[PDB]
Every structure is written in structure tokens, then in C-alpha cells.
Amino acid sequence: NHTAHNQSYKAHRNGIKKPKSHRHSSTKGMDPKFLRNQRYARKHNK
Amino acid sequence: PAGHGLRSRTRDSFSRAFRKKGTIALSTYLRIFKIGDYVDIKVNGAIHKGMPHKFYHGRTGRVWNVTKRAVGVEVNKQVRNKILRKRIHVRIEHVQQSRCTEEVRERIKKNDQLKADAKARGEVISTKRQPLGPKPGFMVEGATLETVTPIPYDVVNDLKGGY
Amino acid sequence: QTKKILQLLRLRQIFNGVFLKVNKATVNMLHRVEPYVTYGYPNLKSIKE
Amino acid sequence: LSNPMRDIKVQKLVLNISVGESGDRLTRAAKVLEQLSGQSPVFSKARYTVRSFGIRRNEKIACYVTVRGEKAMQLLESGLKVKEYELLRRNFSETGCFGFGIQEHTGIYGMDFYVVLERPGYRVARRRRCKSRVGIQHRVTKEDSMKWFQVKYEGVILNK
Amino acid sequence: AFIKVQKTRAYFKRFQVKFKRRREGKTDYRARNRLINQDKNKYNTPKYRFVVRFTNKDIIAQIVSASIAGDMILASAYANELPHYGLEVGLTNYAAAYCTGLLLARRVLKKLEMDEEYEGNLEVNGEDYSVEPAESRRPFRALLDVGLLRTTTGNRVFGALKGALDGGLDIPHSEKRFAGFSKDSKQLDADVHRKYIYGGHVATYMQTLIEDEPEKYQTHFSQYIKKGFEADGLEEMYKKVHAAIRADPHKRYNLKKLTYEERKAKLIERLNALNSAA
Amino acid sequence: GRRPARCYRQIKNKPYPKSRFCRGVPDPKIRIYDVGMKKKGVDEFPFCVHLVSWEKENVSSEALEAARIACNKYMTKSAGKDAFHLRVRVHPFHVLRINKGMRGAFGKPQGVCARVAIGQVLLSVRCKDGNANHAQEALRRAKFKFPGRQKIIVSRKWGFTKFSRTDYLKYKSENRIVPDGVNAKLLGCHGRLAARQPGRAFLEAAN
RNA sequence: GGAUGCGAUCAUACCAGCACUAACGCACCGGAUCCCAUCAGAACUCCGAAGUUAAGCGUGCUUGGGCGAGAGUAGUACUAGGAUGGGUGACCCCCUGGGAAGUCCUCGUGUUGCAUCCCU
RNA sequence: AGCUCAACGAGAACAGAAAUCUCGUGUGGAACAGAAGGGUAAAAGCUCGUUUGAUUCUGAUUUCCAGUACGAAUACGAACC
RNA sequence: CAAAGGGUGUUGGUCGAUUAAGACAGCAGC
RNA sequence: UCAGGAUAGCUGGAGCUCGCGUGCGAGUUCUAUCGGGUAAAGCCAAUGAUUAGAGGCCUCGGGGCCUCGACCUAUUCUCAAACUUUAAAUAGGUAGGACGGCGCGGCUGCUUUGUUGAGCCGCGCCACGGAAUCAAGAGCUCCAAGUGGGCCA
Numbered sequence A: 001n002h003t004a005h006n007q008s009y010k011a012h013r014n015g016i017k018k019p020k021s022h023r024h025s026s027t028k029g030m031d032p033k034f035l036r037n038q039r040y041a042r043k044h045n046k
Numbered sequence B: 001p002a003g004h005g006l007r008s009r010t011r012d013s014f015s016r017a018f019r020k021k022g023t024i025a026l027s028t029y030l031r032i033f034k035i036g037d038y039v040d041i042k043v044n045g046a047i048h049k050g051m052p053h054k055f056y057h058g059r060t061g062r063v064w065n066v067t068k069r070a071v072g073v074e075v076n077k078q079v080r081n082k083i084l085r086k087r088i089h090v091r092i093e094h095v096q097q098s099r100c101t102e103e104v105r106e107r108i109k110k111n112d113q114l115k116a117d118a119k120a121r122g123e124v125i126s127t128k129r130q131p132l133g134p135k136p137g138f139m140v141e142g143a144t145l146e147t148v149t150p151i152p153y154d155v156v157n158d159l160k161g162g163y
Numbered sequence C: 001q002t003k004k005i006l007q008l009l010r011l012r013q014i015f016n017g018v019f020l021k022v023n024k025a026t027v028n029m030l031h032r033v034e035p036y037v038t039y040g041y042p043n044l045k046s047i048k049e
Numbered sequence D: 001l002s003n004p005m006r007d008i009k010v011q012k013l014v015l016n017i018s019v020g021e022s023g024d025r026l027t028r029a030a031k032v033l034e035q036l037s038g039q040s041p042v043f044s045k046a047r048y049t050v051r052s053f054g055i056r057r058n059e060k061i062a063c064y065v066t067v068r069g070e071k072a073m074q075l076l077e078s079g080l081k082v083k084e085y086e087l088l089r090r091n092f093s094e095t096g097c098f099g100f101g102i103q104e105h106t107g108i109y110g111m112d113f114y115v116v117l118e119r120p121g122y123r124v125a126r127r128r129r130c131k132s133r134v135g136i137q138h139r140v141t142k143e144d145s146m147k148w149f150q151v152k153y154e155g156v157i158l159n160k
Numbered sequence E: 001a002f003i004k005v006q007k008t009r010a011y012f013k014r015f016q017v018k019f020k021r022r023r024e025g026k027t028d029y030r031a032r033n034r035l036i037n038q039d040k041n042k043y044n045t046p047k048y049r050f051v052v053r054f055t056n057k058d059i060i061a062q063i064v065s066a067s068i069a070g071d072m073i074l075a076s077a078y079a080n081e082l083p084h085y086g087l088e089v090g091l092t093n094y095a096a097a098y099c100t101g102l103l104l105a106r107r108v109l110k111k112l113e114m115d116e117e118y119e120g121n122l123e124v125n126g127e128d129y130s131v132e133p134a135e136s137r138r139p140f141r142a143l144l145d146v147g148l149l150r151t152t153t154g155n156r157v158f159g160a161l162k163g164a165l166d167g168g169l170d171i172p173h174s175e176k177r178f179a180g181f182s183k184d185s186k187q188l189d190a191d192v193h194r195k196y197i198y199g200g201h202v203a204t205y206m207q208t209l210i211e212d213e214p215e216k217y218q219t220h221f222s223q224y225i226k227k228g229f230e231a232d233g234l235e236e237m238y239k240k241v242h243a244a245i246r247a248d249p250h251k252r253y254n255l256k257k258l259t260y261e262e263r264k265a266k267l268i269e270r271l272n273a274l275n276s277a278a
Numbered sequence F: 001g002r003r004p005a006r007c008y009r010q011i012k013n014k015p016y017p018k019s020r021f022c023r024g025v026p027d028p029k030i031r032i033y034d035v036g037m038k039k040k041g042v043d044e045f046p047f048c049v050h051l052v053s054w055e056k057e058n059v060s061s062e063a064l065e066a067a068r069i070a071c072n073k074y075m076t077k078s079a080g081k082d083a084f085h086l087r088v089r090v091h092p093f094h095v096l097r098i099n100k101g102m103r104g105a106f107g108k109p110q111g112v113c114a115r116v117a118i119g120q121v122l123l124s125v126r127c128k129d130g131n132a133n134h135a136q137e138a139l140r141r142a143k144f145k146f147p148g149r150q151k152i153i154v155s156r157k158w159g160f161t162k163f164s165r166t167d168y169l170k171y172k173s174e175n176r177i178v179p180d181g182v183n184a185k186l187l188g189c190h191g192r193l194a195a196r197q198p199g200r201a202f203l204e205a206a207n
Numbered sequence G: 001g002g003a004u005g006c007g008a009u010c011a012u013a014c015c016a017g018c019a020c021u022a023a024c025g026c027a028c029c030g031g032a033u034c035c036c037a038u039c040a041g042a043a044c045u046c047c048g049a050a051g052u053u054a055a056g057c058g059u060g061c062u063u064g065g066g067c068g069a070g071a072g073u074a075g076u077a078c079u080a081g082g083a084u085g086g087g088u089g090a091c092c093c094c095c096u097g098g099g100a101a102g103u104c105c106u107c108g109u110g111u112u113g114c115a116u117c118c119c120u
Numbered sequence H: 001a002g003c004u005c006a007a008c009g010a011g012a013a014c015a016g017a018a019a020u021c022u023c024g025u026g027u028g029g030a031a032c033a034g035a036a037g038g039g040u041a042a043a044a045g046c047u048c049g050u051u052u053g054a055u056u057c058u059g060a061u062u063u064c065c066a067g068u069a070c071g072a073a074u075a076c077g078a079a080c081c
Numbered sequence I: 001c002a003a004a005g006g007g008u009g010u011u012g013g014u015c016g017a018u019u020a021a022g023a024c025a026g027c028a029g030c
Numbered sequence J: 001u002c003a004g005g006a007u008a009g010c011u012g013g014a015g016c017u018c019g020c021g022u023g024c025g026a027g028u029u030c031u032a033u034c035g036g037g038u039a040a041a042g043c044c045a046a047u048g049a050u051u052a053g054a055g056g057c058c059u060c061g062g063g064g065c066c067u068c069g070a071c072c073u074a075u076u077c078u079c080a081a082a083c084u085u086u087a088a089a090u091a092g093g094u095a096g097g098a099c100g101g102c103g104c105g106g107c108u109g110c111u112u113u114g115u116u117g118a119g120c121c122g123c124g125c126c127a128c129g130g131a132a133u134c135a136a137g138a139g140c141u142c143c144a145a146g147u148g149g150g151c152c153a
């Protein structure tokens, strides 16, 4: 029916793969009110 | 779904501590959360809104968003051969500020001054910590020696308090 | 676990040998592969040979 | 012990008429209290349905009214006068309270007289803010209530 | 028959004590939580509470902000210090509450160095007032914390609220609870509200007793008579007090815990006495 | 009828006591756990001997009653009806199931048994020093009623109390012992002082 | 040294009984015209200041209960790894490591922030 | 917004084990539509007042998981209440 | 593959009792 | 749909982007910190189950003043996958720098009583690599096979 046998072995053949971490992360899902003002702040930045 | 509800197997994990029920102390609501801070997720059983899934209970994550009543938290989750960066929003009642990096900031300053002091005198050093190493030799003053020997066996003593 | 630790010690073959500095970090690693290894304190003669 | 703030007084007088059934009788019984006390009585409802007593749940089966001040004293002496200023020793509760019942008094209805005795300062247990408990020494005891009844109305306590 | 002890060992083992302020009957933590909880995206933005408390003989007003170590007092005003301004009697009535609220409003604005910009209401006519925002600065904002009292129409707490509003403070509110508001008409009667601000209701009662029960007037208003205050002269007094406020706003007697040695010595004496008995 | 005891000798399942989940459980065979003069005072029977289990096994309630009856009869004849107190120290709270193909094989409750551990006392007898031989012999007969291996150990404690015989006399001579029927209460130095009696108040704990 | 207002920590702070308190307070307390409030001016609300520290609040005490801490229980129970270890088995010793919990015993009974006021 | 429940103790004409009324104790031993678990005491329980956020517009996230859908839930944004 | 339970088979060990003031067996008249 | 298929995983081929110990990687430990309710333990703690006496014997029933049982107090034997105050071992999460820190300025329609915050930007300065061990290196993409009956300790 079911078993986890050998599944950890399969995962470790090429894993465990950590996601690539970049200096800047996506802003999707953050507070739109904060994001909208930040866009205006960069627009008038000088 | 698919044979298990959202809060299945949470009889103990989501229950309040003994004699620690009722009103939540207000220091919880006076905490300040900033982007990049580390927080430990601890579900409070009394607050039923914004509560994370049982998996995230007892996990430490990084704050990536702040809302009126909740903080966005990034938690690593291992799925087969990959680690996923799970982004969840949690009400601040379920999060505690973690002390996992409490020693970092103070350590950096001490390292900076030690290098600065060594730089002025032209002596290259290393500020790295080291694990416990072997102890040096030393002398111990003699004292009365207590002799330890095996005890004769007694069946009557093979029970807490004896028979 | 044992397989990983022996690799970190560079013991990939039976009867291979290596030196190891003594500290709590290394000693605790060695404690976890006890039945697969034997070790001790080498004298000057042993290191020379 | 002789401080003026330790003087006993009648906090309130409660007249209860448990007719045991709704309808015209309850309406007439309520009118008796209103004229006897001068204020609108309250209609109590049965907590549980009991077929033996013939009362259904959430049905008005009794009426009572609370009286305070001079009228409580005026309406209390009348009850004791009918009772001949004599009460049984068991009629006094351990919490400094006592009561009696008359069966003569629309019609004729039997009333239930209960008196609550309190010293000044009982507000501490009644106020909303800083609600507390009255000191044990300051509470009215069973003995204190008996002495008050024996000096206020020079009554007699029959142990029987 | 013998009754089982209700408060046994098991009862106390599992008993959880409420918060000290709750079991002392002084703090409603449901209200407090919703008063001090600030939006997390506002960070260290204090949420000030206009705390008004009434005692049997005094009125306490405070501007309070919450912190982990405890509440911080920005400004305070007591009705007991109103005699410094002229008000000698009735330090707990509706008019005194208005004066106390006004004094706090001018003091906090004085501390914030913005009292010149916001002078408050200059025409106290009993109408609902709210200080309009200035040009280069918004008015100070605070929230009313009434405590455990009942928020009834005409309550003294709303009299202090009106004084704070007339002093130039922004306090969210409505007119449904000011003195003079009518439940049926759903309107605020300015004349009645103005009457309470200057103690007109107090003056009316003083005149009623004089005409009907002069003996009761002497006792019920002994302090008023002792200081030569008449019913018709109360309105002028409060107006003078309001102008004054805007012009310029260890031996031990308790026993000490016995030391371990002292307590043990007394225990031995009792123990020996009990043994020597019988 | 009932299966041979070897079928359920080994402790293989988690405890399965009678509860709202397991219904229709037959009553245990053993219902009496104290025999003899059970009203005798603590000071009457100083001697105490135990029949101690030496294996981890299940003991059926049927065997427990059989051992009690066998031990009781010999002791009554050998020593008398009022010269001993026998107490069964084990209660059967585990329910055994029986499956009367393998589809839906979860069995119905058959009987009850006791989950005994190594070194656990099975039976205890207290009497006078003069009847020590009879008490040990009575437990010997009861040993043949149990499935595993037991052992006879003479207790160093006073009867069924938790105090050693030397300590019991030491405390009793100091007037620190308050009889409580078969039990013995030791007076310390705690509680309300007025509760104690003139000759029963102490400054230091009994050590 | 304390009280009061708002608090933080939420029993070392709770519960029970007994005892005690200068000053300012805080209370109890007086009244029911007005706002408000009920069967009920008890409560809530408004106005007031004759009386009392009786209670509340505060402090102390108890071979008090509870709670907190230590010791001990105990290197015991259990447990990670090891053995062509013992044993018919059930189970158990030893090797490289980790390591509890009632009873019993001793001790403790809050600490503290802002503001105002009394002791001054 | 106010209130405190189950239970017990001591009292009151008819009235009793059990009607209603009074005081006291009462950490929830009650209640919260239903299974069980968790949770809740100036409340999430009980009684009253006013009401329709059981509304409109997308997107994001969690649970399921292939990191697809559906169901369900959560945190925001922009409106109207 | 073997059990409970047994052996005055034999080998170790543990507790107690008796014995040059004469034990034990047999013999003798305690 | 259950003798099948697709899907992900495991696998090959094709490479590409870099790197040469200054690696930012690790089925390991160390240090710091966080979560847990199994083993054991507990009932002399809640809930449930359960044995016996002792004292008090007020008040309720039982029978014959006596008397047994109910009751109350302090003890006591023995228990729980769907009980629990407490509570391991093993295992689980996070962190240990150059994507660091500080100073001086600037931007905003968001936020504040408040150039008060929040995030971001510019300039200047500092930063011996900031635990151990190892690192037959690290990352990324494409196309596709087989497999989707397992069995043993």
C-alpha cells in the first residue's frame, strides 16, 4: 500500500538542494501601501 | 484535506501550558518587528486567527513583511530533494523574537576593536573562536584519599527502599 | 551518519590513517564512529616513520 | 467594637409569592405586591419543567419585590406583628439573615418575608471597581442577627 | 452532616491566579489591549491614552503611553491643584472635570511646544468642538481611557473630554454622551451642555434648596457657604478659572519581617510551652 | 473453553484496560485481595515475607485467585485463622482479546490479566516471628500456581509499613508513631502547632 | 518609609485565620434637584462633605495549605551506539555515551517602571 | 454594554429529594447547534441595545500538493457600511 | 528447537547448628 | 484507476556558466538559542479505574439504646494507546560577516503631534575572512530511457 523505504536515499542522491539566495528578494506579496510609496520615493530620488 | 484536517494531531502542540491560560500578557503586543529579524513561531491556542499550520510551530524564520496585525515569515521546508522558502503571514501572538543571533552583533564589535588595536601595533592576529582544547599540565596538592571498593551484593536491596 | 563522518576525516578505505587535532568539536565527531576506527596518541617515533 | 460604623441595619426586604402557576392568579398576586409595596414586582420563571408540580420551563410561576428604606421597616413590623414578634431559632441563617412567612395577607395569597441585615461598608462587595470581601469580624453573624431582633422588636426566639 | 472541604490541596494546586490588576479590580485588560496595541507597520509610534479617573474627592487626568517597563506619564493634572487657579469647592463635579481636562490639554501642548499653534476653543457655547488642523503641524492625538466606570450620557468623564477638546487636543469622540444630549431627539442641546460646563446644574440645586429646605441647604453646601460662593456666582467663578488655566498651566510605621533567628526562637518557646502543658 | 495460559504469557501489546472504548469485559476471577486477620494492628505482626516475581510476564486473574486460595488454606491450618494477614499485591487490569479468515480480526475481550515486571511483589504475608516458617512454606505452595519464576524474600520492614524494623522501634520509643490500623504514621515537625498533643510535638524531623 | 493613579512581571504576588497602622490619601459614608439608572438611588449615575477608621486598601504573624528554589531520590528508571555477548525463552550483564520523576528533607513568601502627594 | 456559570452550604407560608426567593463559597467541576479534541470568565458563556462584514473589486499566501485544481482558511490593498 | 518440575550423580559457594567438657554411626544399660 | 497509463522522484546524454582553495558548499560536530509530550514517571496532583483498614462518628438510611452501611478526616494496595502535573535519550528548526558595520547627506504620494519613523538611495571610512573538519569544485538548463508487483535483517 505505502512505504517511505528508500525515499530518503533518493532525495540525497542530488539533494538536499537549498534554493539560490540573492541579495534582493521579490517584493510580491508585501504590503501594497508600503510598496507603492517606495516606488514613488525612488521616482523622485536624486 | 485528503484524510487530514488543518489542525489534525494538534491535541498537545496547540494546547496552552498548564496554569498559563486566559488573558495574554500585553508585552506580546508591545513587541516591535522589523524586516530581517529572526522570530520563533509558537502557536498560541487561544488566538484562532492568523495561526500558522502545525508544521511551522517550533520553527524559526526571517521576517520579510509587516502588516497591521501580522508579520510575514520565511520558513525553510524540506520537500523531497529540495528546500522550499515558505512565506507565511502569522499574527504576532504566535511569534516570539528569537535569540539565535544575540551573540553576533556584540561579537562583531569586539572583533573590530581587537583588530584595530592589533593593527596599530603591526601584529597580525585572528579573532576566530575556538572549541574547547586540551588542558595543560598542573599539580594537585595531596589530600586524604577515600578508598572506593565494590559493594557486596544483597538481594533485599534490589528494590527502591528495599524489601 | 558514519559514512559522512569518515569522509570528513578522510578515512575512505580500511587501514587508512590520518592525524587529527584534539578539541571538543573533533572528539565528539570521533565518538560517533567509534566501532569503525581505532586511535590513540602517537609518539615522536610513530610520526617520523 | 462600639464604633458607629458597626451598627446593624436592614439592607432590604424581599416579599416572594410562589403561586406555582401562570394565568389570572399570578396577575392578581402581582397586584397585591404592587399595592402592598408601592412598586412594580418582578415575575420569576421556572428554571426546569416539572410535571409533579405542574410547571413548564420559562413560564411565570412566581412574583417577588424588593423594598428598602423606611417602607421596609414599616412593612416589616406589620409582618412581625402578625407573627406576634416570635421566631424560631432556626429561622436565622448563618450569614446574618432571617425570614418568615404569612398565610393570610383579588383573593388571599401567602407571602414570604425574608430580611437581609448588613452593616455599613458592605458596598465593597457590591461596587464594580475594587470589588472585595467584607472582613470576617465585620460581617453580621447568626448571633448578631438574633440580638438585633431581640432589641429592635423585643421579640422572643423559640428553640422548640 | 459533615461537608467535604471545597478548598482542598487539589483545588489550590490547579488554581491559576488572574493578573494582579484584574484581581484588584482596577484594570480591564480586554479594553487595555485594544487601547495600546499599535499597528506593527507603525513600529515605535506611541499610542497615547487620555486617562481620566474619579476618586471620592479628586479627579486624576493623565496622558499615558505604554512600554515594556510600564506606562510612561507625559503630562498629568489633578483637580486638587485647581485651588491654585481659583476653584475651591466642587472638585469632583462636572465643571471641575471640564477644568481638569482643560488644564491637562494646555500642559501637554506646553510640553510639546505647540500650544501657540493650537489655542483651542475660544467660544465655549456647549456645541461639539474639534480643533481644526494647523498649517504645518497636526494636532496632538490621544484616546480616551474611561476605565471601569459606566459610559452614561452626561458622565463627568465626557465633561473632562470636552475640556480637553476645548484645550486644543484631538480626541476621537461623538456628541452622543455629552451632557444635554437627548436619547429621543438624537441631538445635542448646547444650552444644557453649556449649563453643566459652568456648574449651572449645581447652581440650580443650590437655589432649589434655599427656597424649599433652607436647613438642608446649610448642610448640603456647607463648604460653598463657608467660602462665600453663591449659586448665581458660580458661572463667573468658572470663567475666571478657565482664563487662569490658559494664563499659566524616612521613619517607618509598618512592622518589618522577622528574621529567621527571631522566628525560630519564638517557635521554640511555643513548642516548649505546648509540651509542658498537661 | 479458555485457552492455555501460554497463549497470552508474553507482554506483547500496549495496556488495554476496561474503559468506554472496550465494553463487554468479563469480571476478574479474583475479587478478594486481603485474607486472614486484616483488622490486626500494625504492632501485632512484625514479620513480613514476599513472593516476588522474577520475570516480565502476564499473570492471569485465574492464577492469582488460585495462589491466594492455596496460600490461605495452608496458612490457616498450619498457623491458625487469626495468626496471619495475606494481601495480594497485583490487580489484573489488562484485557485479553480473542479472534473467534484474517479479515477484521480484532478480537473480542476474553478475560483479564496482570502485567507483572521483574522484582514486583505478587503476594505478601505478615505474622508473628514464631510463624515465619509456616508463612514461607505457604508461599512455596502458591509458587506452583504461577507461570513464571518467583522468589521468596523475607522483608526487613515491620509488617506492611515502609519503616525498617529497627527504625519502627526507634520511632515508637520516641513516641513518633501514630497507629492507623495496618498502616503507621510518622510525626514530623510541620503543620499547625495547636494540632499536636502535649507529648507529640517535635522540633526536628525524624532522621 | 509609604500611599494614590497608570503599569510591567502574572501566586515568592494566591487562600485561610489572627494582629496592627503617624501624616496626606484611598475608602466607607450623606443626599436623590438635575444627567442617568433599575422591581429596588443595592448597583449604575449625578450632587455633596456631617460622621468613622468598623470594613476595604496597606503591613506583620502562622512548627498553616498552596506556590517558588535547593537538596535528595540517583547515576536509580529510561535511553543512542556495539558485540559470532549470556540465556531454551522471557529477559539481562558488559563496552562507548546521554540521563529523569513522586514521596521525604531544608529554605523562601515578591520584584519593579512613570507620575503625583505625605512623612518634611 | 452589563452580568457570571455547574455544584454545594445555610435560611423562607402552602413547599417535599426536586417550584420560587435570600446570603455565602464556587478556576469553570457549566455553557458555547452536531463527533471528538483544543479554546474561552468584567468572555468566546448568559441577558439586553443597535444592526446586516453572511457586502462589492482584484491579486497574494497557507492547508492538499505534482508544490496542479477544487473545498477551506489566513494576511493585506482599494470601496461601501 | 525444548519447558515446568526433579536427582544421597558430581563440583563450587552462602547461612545456620553441633563437636576433645567426647559430637555423629554402631555398640552398652537419659 | 488496482496485470495499465500519465505525473514527480531516481538515471543517461548534451552541454553551458564559473572556480583552483581567498571556495559560502556539507546525510558531521562545536557554540548560542528555540520547539516537543514518546520512554520513564505520577495517582501520597485533575479525569477515569481500583484494594483495605483507622479515626471522627456530627447528620442521613438500615435493621436489631445497640447496631451495619452511608458520610467526614488522615492514611493505604494496584493501574491507563484514545488520562496527566512533571519529563528524558535519540531526532527536528535557526544563527556564527564582505549580501558586515559606522558616519554624514538625500528621496517619499507611506507613517508620526513632530525630517517622528519606515524602507530605499548617494558619498566617505573601516572590515586578517571572523567555530572545528572536509570540500576527486560549485551553479544552471535542455532532451530522454527504465521503473511505478518488491523482498530480507
Ligand SMILES: [K+]
Pocket: none
Ligand atoms: K483516524
Ligand SMILES: [K+]
Pocket: F143, F144, F145, F146, F147, F148, F149, F150
Ligand atoms: K512458579
Ligand SMILES: [K+]
Pocket: none
Ligand atoms: K461583552
Ligand SMILES: [K+]
Pocket: none
Ligand atoms: K452566589
Ligand SMILES: [K+]
Pocket: none
Ligand atoms: K547439582
Ligand SMILES: [K+]
Pocket: G101, G102, J041, J042, J086
Ligand atoms: K511523574
Ligand SMILES: [K+]
Pocket: J043
Ligand atoms: K488518580
Ligand SMILES: [K+]
Pocket: none
Ligand atoms: K511512468
Ligand SMILES: [Mg+2]
Pocket: none
Ligand atoms: Mg481528491
Ligand SMILES: [Mg+2]
Pocket: none
Ligand atoms: Mg499523506
Ligand SMILES: [Mg+2]
Pocket: E031
Ligand atoms: Mg469596554
Ligand SMILES: [Mg+2]
Pocket: F012, F013
Ligand atoms: Mg499486537
Ligand SMILES: [Mg+2]
Pocket: G041
Ligand atoms: Mg445611597
Ligand SMILES: [Mg+2]
Pocket: G053
Ligand atoms: Mg481597619
Ligand SMILES: [Mg+2]
Pocket: G064
Ligand atoms: Mg507551609
Ligand SMILES: [Mg+2]
Pocket: none
Ligand atoms: Mg467540543
